Amino acid sequence: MVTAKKDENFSEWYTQAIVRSEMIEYYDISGCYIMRPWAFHIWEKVQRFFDDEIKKMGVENSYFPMFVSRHKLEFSPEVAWVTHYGDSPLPEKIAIRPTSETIMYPAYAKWIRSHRDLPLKLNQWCSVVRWEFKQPTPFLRTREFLWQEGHTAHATEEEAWELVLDILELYRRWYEECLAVPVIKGEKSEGEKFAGGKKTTTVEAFIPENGRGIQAATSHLLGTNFAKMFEIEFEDEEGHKRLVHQTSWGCTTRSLGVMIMTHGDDKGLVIPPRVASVQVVIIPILFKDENTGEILGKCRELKTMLEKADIRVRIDDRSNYTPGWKYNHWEVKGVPLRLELGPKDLAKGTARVVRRDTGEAYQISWADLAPKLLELMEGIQRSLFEKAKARLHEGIEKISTFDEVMPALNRKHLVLAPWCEDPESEEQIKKETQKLSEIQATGAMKTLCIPFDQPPMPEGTKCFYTGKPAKRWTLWGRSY
Amino acid sequence: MVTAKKDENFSEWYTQAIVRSEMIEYYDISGCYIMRPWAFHIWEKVQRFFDDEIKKMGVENSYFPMFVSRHKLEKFSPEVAWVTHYGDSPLPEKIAIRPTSETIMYPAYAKWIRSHRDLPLKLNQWCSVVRWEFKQPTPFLRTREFLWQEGHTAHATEEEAWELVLDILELYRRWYEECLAVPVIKGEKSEGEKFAGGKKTTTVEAFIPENGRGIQAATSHLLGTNFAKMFEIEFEDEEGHKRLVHQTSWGCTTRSLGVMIMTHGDDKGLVIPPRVASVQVVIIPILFENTGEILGKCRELKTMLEKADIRVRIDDRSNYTPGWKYNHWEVKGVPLRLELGPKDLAKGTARVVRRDTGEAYQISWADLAPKLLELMEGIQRSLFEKAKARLHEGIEKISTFDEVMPALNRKHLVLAPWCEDPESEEQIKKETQKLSEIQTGAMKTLCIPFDQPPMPEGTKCFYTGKPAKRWTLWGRSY
Numbered sequence: 001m002v003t004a005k006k007d008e009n010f011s012e013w014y015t016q017a018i019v020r021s022e023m024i025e026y027y028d029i030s031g032c033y034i035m036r037p038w039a040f041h042i043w044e045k046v047q048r049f050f051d052d053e054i055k056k057m058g059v060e061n062s063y064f065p066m067f068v069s070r071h072k073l074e075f076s077p078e079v080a081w082v083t084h085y086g087d088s089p090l091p092e093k094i095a096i097r098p099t100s101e102t103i104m105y106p107a108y109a110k111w112i113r114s115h116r117d118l119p120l121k122l123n124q125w126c127s128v129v130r131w132e133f134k135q136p137t138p139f140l141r142t143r144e145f146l147w148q149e150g151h152t153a154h155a156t157e158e159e160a161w162e163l164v165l166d167i168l169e170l171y172r173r174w175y176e177e178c179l180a181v182p183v184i185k186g187e188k189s190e191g192e193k194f195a196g197g198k199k200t201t202t203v204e205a206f207i208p209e210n211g212r213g214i215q216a217a218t219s220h221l222l223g224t225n226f227a228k229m230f231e232i233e234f235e236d237e238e239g240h241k242r243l244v245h246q247t248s249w250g251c252t253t254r255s256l257g258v259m260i261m262t263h264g265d266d267k268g269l270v271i272p273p274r275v276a277s278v279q280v281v282i283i284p285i286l287f288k289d290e291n292t293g294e295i296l297g298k299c300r301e302l303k304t305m306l307e308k309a310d311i312r313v314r315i316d317d318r319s320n321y322t323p324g325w326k327y328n329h330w331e332v333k334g335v336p337l338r339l340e341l342g343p344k345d346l347a348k349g350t351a352r353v354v355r356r357d358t359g360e361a362y363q364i365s366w367a368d369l370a371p372k373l374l375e376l377m378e379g380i381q382r383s384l385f386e387k388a389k390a391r392l393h394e395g396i397e398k399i400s401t402f403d404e405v406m407p408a409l410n411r412k413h414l415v416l417a418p419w420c421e422d423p424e425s426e427e428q429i430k431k432e433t434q435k436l437s438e439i440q441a442t443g444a445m446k447t448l449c450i451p452f453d454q455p456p457m458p459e460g461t462k463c464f465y466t467g468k469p470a471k472r473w474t475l476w477g478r479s480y
Numbered sequence: 481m482v483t484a485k486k487d488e489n490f491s492e493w494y495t496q497a498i499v500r501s502e503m504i505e506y507y508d509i510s511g512c513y514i515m516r517p518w519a520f521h522i523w524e525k526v527q528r529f530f531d532d533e534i535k536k537m538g539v540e541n542s543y544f545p546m547f548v549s550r551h552k553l554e555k556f557s558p559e560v561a562w563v564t565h566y567g568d569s570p571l572p573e574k575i576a577i578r579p580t581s582e583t584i585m586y587p588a589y590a591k592w593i594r595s596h597r598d599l600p601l602k603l604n605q606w607c608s609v610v611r612w613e614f615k616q617p618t619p620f621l622r623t624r625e626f627l628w629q630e631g632h633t634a635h636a637t638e639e640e641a642w643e644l645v646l647d648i649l650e651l652y653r654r655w656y657e658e659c660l661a662v663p664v665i666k667g668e669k670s671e672g673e674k675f676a677g678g679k680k681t682t683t684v685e686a687f688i689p690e691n692g693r694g695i696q697a698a699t700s701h702l703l704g705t706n707f708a709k710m711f712e713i714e715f716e717d718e719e720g721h722k723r724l725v726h727q728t729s730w731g732c733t734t735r736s737l738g739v740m741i742m743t744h745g746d747d748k749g750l751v752i753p754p755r756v757a758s759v760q761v762v763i764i765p766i767l768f769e770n771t772g773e774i775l776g777k778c779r780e781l782k783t784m785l786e787k788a789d790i791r792v793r794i795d796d797r798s799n800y801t802p803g804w805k806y807n808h809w810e811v812k813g814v815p816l817r818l819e820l821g822p823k824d825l826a827k828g829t830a831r832v833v834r835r836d837t838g839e840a841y842q843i844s845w846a847d848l849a850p851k852l853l854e855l856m857e858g859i860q861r862s863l864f865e866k867a868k869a870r871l872h873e874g875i876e877k878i879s880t881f882d883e884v885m886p887a888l889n890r891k892h893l894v895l896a897p898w899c900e901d902p903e904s905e906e907q908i909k910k911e912t913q914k915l916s917e918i919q920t921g922a923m924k925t926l927c928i929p930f931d932q933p934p935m936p937e938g939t940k941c942f943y944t945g946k947p948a949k950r951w952t953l954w955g956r957s958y
């Protein structure tokens with residue numbers, strides 16, 4: 001059982017919740033964690049979702065090596081270097097993958113010759129390693145992390161930009177539709193974008209309990225900057241040699257940590273049904289040998305019934321644990337529905353179903369279970385999302401002047417503020433908010449994104465900070 | 481177009497075929513290779529197949545770190561890759577890249593397992609492994625980075641652990657024989673060949689005729705209790721007494737793709753079994769001038785074939801002749817080509833050519849889906865039955881040591897009665913190597929097959945002249 005309160009010590013709550021639901025096991029190399037089966041199931045669900053979707057776009061999977069040679073790689077303090085095999089030193093040291101541009105792009109130069117070879121659309125599911133300097137957090141910031149990375153190459157900027165946006169929408173679907181986590185689509189500012197690219201888009205999420213925005217995934221319009229460094233050129237139809245226009249995009253096991261932080265409570269995890277490996281757990285109530293044979297047969301019948309409706313059902317008929325130990329176990333683990341079947345319920349042809357998010361109980365006849373559970377699972381899923389969306393919305397404050405900022409940050413909120421979008425000002429702003437945060441004693445404020453969904457901008461509106469005329473509403477806050 | 485001949489210059493043939501088919505790209509770090517979509521899709525198929533099967537046995541997936549600290553790993557040496565720095569800074573202890581995950585998984589098992597009610601514990605992971613192999617790299621078969629799965633289970637008893645060893649072994653036979661159409665032989669490794677951290681090692685063995693080598697295809701270990709003793713993986717039984725767990729581990733790699741390539745390939749290139757082919761049917765319109773008539777019909781046909789779950793591509797590229805296209809998709813191993821030209825449009829038909837034998841069929845549009853489903857099953861079956869006959873012809877049953885070198889010189893394996901004395905295997909290895917030079921060349925045990933031929937009473941070991949135990953399969957190896 002979980003005992004730290006989510007709203008008191010958030011850190012300790014998260015650690016307890018992920019350990020006691022058997023999602024992660026700690027490890028001796030710092031910043032690395034073991035992903036146990038209960039967490040791995042959720043990743044498997046989002047993986048299959050995303051993978052299926054990108055295949056409909058013609059993206060194909062591949063696997064490129066985990067090693068890149070020193071001279072091809074040449075961010076530096078993060079790179080893990082292999083220097084030896086056994087007691088022997090490598091003639092030239094080798095780096096483990098931190099990203100795969102330097103591994104993929106020279107091959108792309110070789111394979112692309114003509115318009116007939118475009119678009120080239122590849123992905124890979126793999127792990128990367130970055131010797132993170134920041135405080136590690138299981139899922140959210142780890143030194144080895146699982147991800148996919150998508151890398152595409154096209155004839156025109158328009159087609160590449162369209163795929164950038166399609167992928168971004170798929171990531172809104174991974175968070176929103178699978179994980180029931182609300183995200184904001186935006187553009188990264190010039191200071192925050194991937195420097196090898198032209199434009200970076202993001203989906204951004206929010207952790208209410210510590211006030212932090214967090215980048216949930218990313219999708220880059222790379223332009224022709226990398227085609228030029230790597231000599232990725234093709235002949236069009238009229239015999240002419242052109243640079244490719246490229247995209248890349250990635251999303252990681254960070255997504256699980258965001259889910260856990262978003263929906264969990266004081267009793268531990270709450271898993272949204274769309275990604276729960278066990279949607280419904282059936283618990284026989286077995287005590288002083290009362291009806292034990294008939295309770296178990298009904299449990300099996302109920303399961304076959306529910307899986308005809310494609311519900312994911314487990315019977316926990318394990319002998320060596322009490323029914324109450326099972327209630328608690330599958331609560332902490334975040335199973336959406338718990339169906340209890342004891343002697344009394346057996347006599348009435350009913351079952352008692354407890355939903356995990358609100359703790360509400362229902363009495364339901366065997367004949368209405370399938371359609372009633374499906375309805376409840378759709379209500380849990382929608383309800384998790386809507387409550388998280390309202391919290392997201394409660395957490396962002398529309399403002400006009402710099403004077404409003406530090407108070408908004410102290411309330412653990414984000415700010416939506418009009419901004420001139422000048423690179424020099426973000427640097428000034430972050431150095432400044434850091435100063436005032438140190439003095440007040442918890443971190444600098446930065447841009448998260450410029451949201452796609454722009455509210456109206458009145459003609460004389462000025463930038464909240466410089467005073468120059470503003471261009472767009474930009475979302476700022478503290479961040480992971 | 482492939483030009484090295486598969487029987488005559490096998491090594492060149494293999495390199496050409498995997499490169500020209502667009503399966504692999506060569507890379508500047510030795511023994512590492514890019515797996516392009518054409519190959520990777522086959523990996524995805526076998527992965528999905530094996531993963532669904534082990535999920536039915538209650539095995540669950542997990543991801544353990546790729547890094548293991550020196551003190552945990554050294555609880556082989558020359559193969560370990562060591563990370564000593566991050567950026568310009570030295571780590572306090574050097575970290576190994578996971579050559580295999582025993583030393584990463586078993587301390588966690590020792591934490592998680594306390595009572596009989598925690599058992600069985602059954603995990604698998606899909607990951608890559610790194611070993612700095614001393615032997616010559618070969619794409620797929622022996623690489624310095626490879627993809628695999630590793631399964632590791634723990635049981636209250638030896639008998640349940642063994643049951644699982646054999647079930648996993650059966651799944652490996654299905655990975656090879658049902659998905660890749662590659663015949664394999666189940667058997668027990670000898671004492672010198674088994675995994676030394678285990679009690680008994682079971683295997684599926686395969687055979688490459690063109691160089692006469694056996695190759696271990698996959699492996700499944702009854703580990704017994706020795707790791708449980710080493711890592712202190714113990715549980716209280718039902719009476720409160722502490723007991724050691726009984727463990728298994730098993731694994732299979734991208735080696736399997738290379739075996740499939742070599743098994744079914746011919747002088748024109750790859751031949752991919754339909755169950756795993758990325759494209760099962762390529763539609764090649766006879767075009768040189770486009771008007772929409774041919775291409776329109778080819779789209780309608782693709783839609784109809786996809787309804788029947790056929791993986792179809794239309795090669796509508798403008799600048800290639802149909803002949804160039806036939807060759808291209810033949811080198812890639814597409815099992816069925818569907819040709820659609822003006823004459824075909826005029827007669828409501830399509831001409832389908834099989835990659836494995838070259839036979840052509842004329843088929844009405846209406847009959848396409850069922851006839852192609854039938855062909856695919858004919859191709860998959862015929863690829864297997866042919867490879868199985870070649871495997872059979874590659875093994876000579878013998879009685880005496882004098883029949884050995886001639887059988888090895890015929891690029892054949894030997895099946896021989898053996899006393900199974902461990903000293904004798906070391907001797908046979910040395911004496912066959914030394915005769916290979918004065919004429920690696922060593923002949924070693926591949927396995928002791930579950931399928932034993934008859935052993936008449938009094939049959940003698942082919943090497944020691946002592947009483948023979950079982951027939952053992954021997955040859956040159958990867």
Ligand SMILES: Nc1ncnc2c1ncn2[C@@H]1O[C@H](COP(=O)(O)OP(=O)(O)NP(=O)(O)O)[C@@H](O)[C@H]1O
Nearest residue numbers: 132139140141142145215216217218250251252254
């Ligand atoms: N250490 C990490 N652990 C887990 N997820 C990560 C980690 N670093 C990045 N991610 C996620 O992976 C996505 C793509 O990686 P990338 O764009 O390289 O991130 P980044 O530039 O390193 N962001 P940041 O580390 O905050 O500077 C990010 O948008 C994050 O959602």
Ligand SMILES: Nc1ncnc2c1ncn2[C@@H]1O[C@H](COP(=O)(O)OP(=O)(O)NP(=O)(O)O)[C@@H](O)[C@H]1O
Nearest residue numbers: 613620621622623624626696697698699731733735
């Ligand atoms: N370098 C490699 N590349 C690809 N597959 C491999 C490689 N080494 C082993 N395998 C395969 O993985 C299976 C399990 O690995 P493992 O049991 O560790 O083999 P091993 O003991 O290293 N065999 P070997 O190295 O030939 O003596 C082996 O039976 C092979 O089928």
Ligand SMILES: O=C(C[C@H]1NCCC[C@@H]1O)Cn1cnc2cc(Br)c(Cl)cc2c1=O
Nearest residue numbers: 075076078079098099149194218248249250
């Ligand atoms: O990794 C990226 C840019 C994109 N690469 C493809 C997947 C999606 C991803 O956003 C940014 N990035 C982040 N961290 C890095 C760390 C190191 Br070390 C290196 Cl060499 C390079 C990088 C690096 O390029």
Ligand SMILES: O=C(C[C@H]1NCCC[C@@H]1O)Cn1cnc2cc(Br)c(Cl)cc2c1=O
Nearest residue numbers: 556557559560579580630675699729730731
């Ligand atoms: O890797 C194995 C034993 C088993 N591990 C799980 C998958 C199936 C496999 O047969 C044998 N082996 C092979 N090569 C190794 C190389 C090194 Br380096 C190390 Cl440390 C250890 C090993 C090592 O243990």
Ligand SMILES: [Mg+2]
Nearest residue numbers: 078130132133
């Ligand atoms: Mg970073």
Ligand SMILES: [Mg+2]
Nearest residue numbers: 191192193215
């Ligand atoms: Mg950043």
Ligand SMILES: [Mg+2]
Nearest residue numbers: 672673674958
């Ligand atoms: Mg060996």
